[model samples]
Target: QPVAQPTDIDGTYTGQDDGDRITLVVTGTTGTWTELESDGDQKVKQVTLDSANQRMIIGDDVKIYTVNGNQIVVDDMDRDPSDQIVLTK
Candidate 1:
């Protein structure tokens, strides 16, 4: 048997990338949600789980790549503002 996954609600998560790192900003209350990467990486499809430590995944064309050490924020949340990646691609 497999453990059940947490149901995602409807909302919009804002992803902010500097140059190397990235982040996810989750919103809404309840509804199926999907992460839309600005990179245009279609393979990304959807994003799972809200990052806590420090990381984010972005879509960069046909393949989706994961970005680390980047700045990320969701609605009223944020990892860091001062130190982070570039303005993103």
Candidate 2:
């Protein structure tokens, strides 16, 4: 069987990181993201899908995420402690 292709990711998502809320908006491979613990809204920068790996790249900083039911499992790929962030739409 062939693998399924990833679909366009256009929606609003909510997540938590270090007890702070994070909001993500995606539209046509670009959007805005903000964290309650951080500064102002930040641009997503760029979006790319790696279907073969079943992952989504959120920005130049390279936040990787995977779709799971109604949520997206985010892996920051941190070098220090390695954190996993989950977001739901």
Candidate 3:
């Protein structure tokens, strides 16, 4: 069988870094990360969801995430408990 395809991961989401607000707009295989409060450079990268591996690749960021309903939980391997990226659609 072929790999599973994710359906709900492609949409607008509220992302956070240490509870700081950010935006993630996902369409097709691209994700645009935006900072609403600061003038930092936006992170626009090729994002792919590998259902067989249960992983999400965003540019240089390769992390494990589970697309449950309208939520995405990014897990940081071998890192501290605070190294998680929580995204809610």
Q: Give the TM-score of each candidate.
A: 0.21, 0.62, 0.67
Candidate order by decreasing lDDT: 3, 2, 1
lDDT of 2 at 80: 34
Ranking by TM-score: 3, 2, 1
lDDT of 3 by residue, 63-87 (tens): 6766767877767544346787778
Give the number of the best model, judged by TM-score: 3
Over 1-89, each residue of candidate 1 has an lDDT whose tens digit, in order, gives 12222233323333344332232333322112233345743222334443333222333212112232232222212424353333221
lDDT winner between candidates 1 and 3: 3
lDDT of residue 10 for candidate 1: 29
lDDT by residue for model 2 (1-89), tens: 22333567678888887767877776754566667755544433345656555455665666556666668677755523347878889
Computed on alpha carbons, the lDDT of every model, listed in order, comes to: 0.30, 0.64, 0.67
Error of 3 at 51 (Å): 1.9
How many clashes show up per model? 14, 0, 0
Off by over 4 Å in 1: 1-9, 19-45, 50-89
- Whole-structure CA lDDT of model 1: 0.30
How many angstroms is residue 4 displaced in model 1 relative to the true structure, after the best TM-score fit?
Answer: 15
